[PDB]
Design a binder for this molecule. Sequence first.
Ligand SMILES: *[C@@H]1O[C@H](CO)[C@@H](O[C@@H]2O[C@H](CO)[C@@H](O)[C@H](O)[C@H]2NC(C)=O)[C@H](O)[C@H]1NC(C)=O
Ligand SMILES: *[C@@H]1O[C@H](CO)[C@@H](O[C@@H]2O[C@H](CO)[C@@H](O)[C@H](O)[C@H]2NC(C)=O)[C@H](O)[C@H]1NC(C)=O
Ligand SMILES: N[C@@H](CCC(=O)O)C(=O)O
Lengths: 48, 203, 45, 49, 119, 49
Amino acid sequence: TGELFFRSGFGIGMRKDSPWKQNVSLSILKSHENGFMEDLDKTWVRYQ
Amino acid sequence: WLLWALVFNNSVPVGTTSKIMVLVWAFFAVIFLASYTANLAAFMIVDTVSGLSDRKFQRPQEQYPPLKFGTVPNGSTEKNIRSNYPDMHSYMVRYNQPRVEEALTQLKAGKLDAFIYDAAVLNYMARKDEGCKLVTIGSGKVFATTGYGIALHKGSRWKRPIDLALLQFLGDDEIEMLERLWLSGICHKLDIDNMAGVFYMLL
Amino acid sequence: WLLWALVFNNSVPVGTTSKIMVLVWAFFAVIFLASYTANLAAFMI
Amino acid sequence: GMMGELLSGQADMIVAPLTINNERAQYIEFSKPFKYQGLTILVKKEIPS
Amino acid sequence: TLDSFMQPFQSTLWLLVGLSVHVVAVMLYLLDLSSAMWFSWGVLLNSGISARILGMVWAGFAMIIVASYTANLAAFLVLDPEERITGINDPRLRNPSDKFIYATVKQSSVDIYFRRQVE
Amino acid sequence: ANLAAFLVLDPEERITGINDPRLRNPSDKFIYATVKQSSVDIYFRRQVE
Ligand SMILES: *[C@@H]1O[C@H](CO)[C@@H](O[C@@H]2O[C@H](CO)[C@@H](O)[C@H](O)[C@H]2NC(C)=O)[C@H](O)[C@H]1NC(C)=O
Ligand SMILES: *[C@@H]1O[C@H](CO)[C@@H](O[C@@H]2O[C@H](CO)[C@@H](O)[C@H](O)[C@H]2NC(C)=O)[C@H](O)[C@H]1NC(C)=O
Ligand SMILES: N[C@@H](CCC(=O)O)C(=O)O
């Protein structure tokens, strides 16, 4: 019930000043564009 | 002798222990038809697409051709289409060249059937528009969901503070207030049933 | 001869120009009772 | 919590449904989001004759 | 006052009902004006007052059909506006447009009020 | 006909959101809770109102 508030998404974390930040963010964005994330959401969340 | 006249029950003009149960059945039947309208009133008082995986979008050659569904080139959506669907690009030359508004005008006058653009610009040009023009099943089609950003110089000093400040605006609902102010909208079987009922009654 | 049976109109089982207008009046009457529930539902709900 | 394990304990990444907000991003770097959402309220539907 | 029966019924339902009634009258009269006159009178609103028994059987079936159709028409008839802005934050007033024109008294308290709220 | 017109009749379940008077005014009658030491606890600790 109700409408969404505080609309801030999830996110992979990493330690402050870590070399993995740029590459992890790039891979997440490429997965988003590639349609992989849609397929994952369909497999593990929707269709119940 | 019995049954058939009783089986007629509710009808036009058209003894023993049978009469009592016939009267009881008739009372139950007339109560049932009286409640028929009640449940009709209680109960009584739609999408042409579900995603880009639809046969029409996926297959350009399927019966009638979609009326040159298109998008504004030189952007992100065009790059997405040209990368992940290198078959839609061939059937995308007949696009709406000018900015959004011309495409909306053409869509209103039956020139094209579908428009693929951002999910915020277009969602705004779906509530402010007069009458009502609807998006495909809300944000169920949203493909490669990403967010508007603030481009900065590679490894700039301001990349860290801006972020923090921006996150603060989500905590105090200030961005929600701005969105409510600047992005508020107002948009948010007769003959077929008659023919079906006539056919059912005839059969 | 006429009138009284026609004046009964909506009821339980009970010149040549009388039958046509009687049927027309009966049709208008049943339409009126059908719309009785319609206006009751509109006003009450 | 998990932030304790990531910040100083035995951790290097936190792959879990972790939200993003100001009080967390100060000491932890956050990748770009991989799913969008918002806080919402769940209640028991009324039983229906 | 009534001015609504044409919307869900119009010419289509009337033509369909008339054609069906006339075809039924002709067919079940032929397989047996004059007898067809009262046969059609039976198929009218509610009613107006071997081969023959089963003829009465299909006549009763057609009467069930007619009663059902009348019930559907009555259920379609029951139906029901707009006349209010929301207030001072309605999108119509929040977003100015030439379609909607609203004004207040010049040089009055309302002009004072809509000059300090910068938003 | 009057009985039929009286018969046609017709609930309640949803709340308003985060500003509903039931939640705005705490009372022992209504109990609502969130996960302890989570993002929601962070959110309901900076909005002083
Ligand atoms: C991030 O990923 C990129 C691409 O996968 C890495 O770029 C190459 O990394 C290898 C090994 O680290 C180097 O030998 C190459 O010179 C890099 N550049 C190219 C063009 O191949 C990058 O190293 C990764 N960064 C981190 C911190 O893992
Ligand atoms: C999309 O990009 C193309 C290519 O960059 C643009 O085509 C250019 O348009 C300008 C102005 O009309 C011309 O001076 C160039 O010669 C064109 N170049 C090519 C290769 O066609 C096009 O105008 C852009 N469209 C939009 C809406 O931005
Ligand atoms: N946000 C989109 C707008 C439309 C487009 O450019 O394709 C972009 O800048 O990429």
